[PDB]
Ligand binder design. Structure first.
Ligand SMILES: [Ca+2]
Ligand SMILES: [Fe+3]
Ligand SMILES: [Fe+3]
Ligand SMILES: [Fe+3]
Ligand SMILES: [Fe+3]
Lengths: 125, 125
């Protein structure tokens, strides 16, 4: 595992993010945890690829070009903004907007979002 | 597991942060990953308990009341600022000062830090 990677435990539901890398394989509920690699799922990019907008003092992230659903059974669980050595995470729940604002001083950033159904997605400016 | 809990594999060094809880037990290198509970390690609070300072637009976090070492074999790996729905993580490296600045609009915050040797610590404003 490498820092910032997101792993999911099939069946049991746990989802973790790596803070410190290592060689060991993460296991849960009798199987290796699944690496949720960004932009690998066969789903509409229009609703899943994060859109980054530069604002005063930071960035505004929307998921996505077309607003993604935020329903009890299908929503964006969180949005993250990655920069230099920073990982800012904004958790979301059904009924909220698929959007997040991050105040940071970084010219180059990477935005990520995780959909409970369609996986992990990212975009950069 | 519960959201934002930190777990570590005492064998290979993998350390992860829970994004979604689930019901499965996290395993690595043939043993349950260890829940790194905050303020449980028998270490000096003066250098480990985060100190939070409110600034314009956010908070400055220092580890701790007395500056903690930042050497190759003993340093603060990261400082985080938690809200009711946000987790901002600032990774650090040896040589740096044990501090971080977070621009955020939240009245109540929890600051956490992880020392590679002395573990997980937290404090609230
Ligand atoms: Ca984070
Ligand atoms: Fe391990
Ligand atoms: Fe989706
Ligand atoms: Fe599991
Ligand atoms: Fe220490």
């Amino acid at each position: 595992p490498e820092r910032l990677q997101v792993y999911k435990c099939e069946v049991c539901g746990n989802i973790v993010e790596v803070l410190n890398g290592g060689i060991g394989e993460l296991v849960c509920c009798n199987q290796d945890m699944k690496l949720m690699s960004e932009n690998t799922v066969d789903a509409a990019k229009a609703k899943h690829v994060p859109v980054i907008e530069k604002i005063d003092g930071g960035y505004k992230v929307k998921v996505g070009a077309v607003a993604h659903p935020m329903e009890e059974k299908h929503y964006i669980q969180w949005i993250e903004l990655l920069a230099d050595d920073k990982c800012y995470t904004q958790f979301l729940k059904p009924g909220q907007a698929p959007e997040a604002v991050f105040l940071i001083e970084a010219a180059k950033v990477v935005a990520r979002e995780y959909c409970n159904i369609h996986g992990h997605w990212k975009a950069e400016n």
